Structures are given as structure tokens and as C-alpha cells.
């Protein structure tokens, strides 16, 4: 996920393109909603995979 962004993305028409690769190995819903409210407030991330 880190190597897919560096040498690729040559035709980048937006400017606020930044990838965030995180690993939540355990998926209890309290921590999941915590990560949602942390990433959505984290400089307006528009991608949730």
C-alpha cells in the first residue's frame, strides 16, 4: 500500500492525494467507530477501504 503510491500515480489531477495505510487486526465495533471518527476528522479523508 505504501509502494503503490510512490512510483505510480503520474496523472494526478487533484492535489490533496495522500494515502493512509493502517492495520486494525482486531475488529471490535467500539474501536472501529473510534477509527472512523479519527480518520474522517483526520484532514478530511474521503476514502475508506
Amino acid at each position: 500500500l505504501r509502494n503503490l503510491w510512490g512510483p505510480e500515480q503520474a496523472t494526478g489531477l487533484p492535489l490533496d492525494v495522500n494515502v493512509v495505510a493502517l492495520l486494525m487486526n482486531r475488529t471490535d465495533p467500539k474501536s472501529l467507530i473510534t477509527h472512523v471518527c479519527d480518520l474522517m476528522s483526520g484532514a478530511r479523508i474521503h476514502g475508506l477501504v
Partner: protein, 49 residues
């Protein structure tokens, strides 16, 4: 103007627990695939038809 018990039922719905939403009688709560375990005790407006 939300009138949505959907975040409570979906927060308790990652464990797939039935949540009784008793706010309104909308037909969008009557779907089986959108609302898997959301079993209410109120009928939709199709019973008025």
C-alpha cells in the same frame, strides 16, 4: 430531522443483535437485506394500503 434508529441498530449489529427500533413506520425499515436483524413491532404504511 433525522428520525433514524439505524446507527444504534447498526452499532449493535456488527455482532448481528436484534434491535427494536420504535420511532417511525417507514417502508425503508421493511427490507430484509438492508435490515437483517432489525426486527421491529410496528408495521409499515403498506398495511394502510
Amino acid at each position: 430531522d433525522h428520525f433514524t434508529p439505524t446507527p444504534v441498530s447498526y452499532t449493535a449489529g456488527f455482532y448481528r443483535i436484534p434491535v427494536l427500533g420504535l420511532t417511525t413506520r417507514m417502508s425503508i425499515y421493511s427490507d430484509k437485506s438492508i435490515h437483517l436483524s432489525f426486527l421491529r413491532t410496528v408495521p409499515p404504511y403498506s398495511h394502510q394500503s
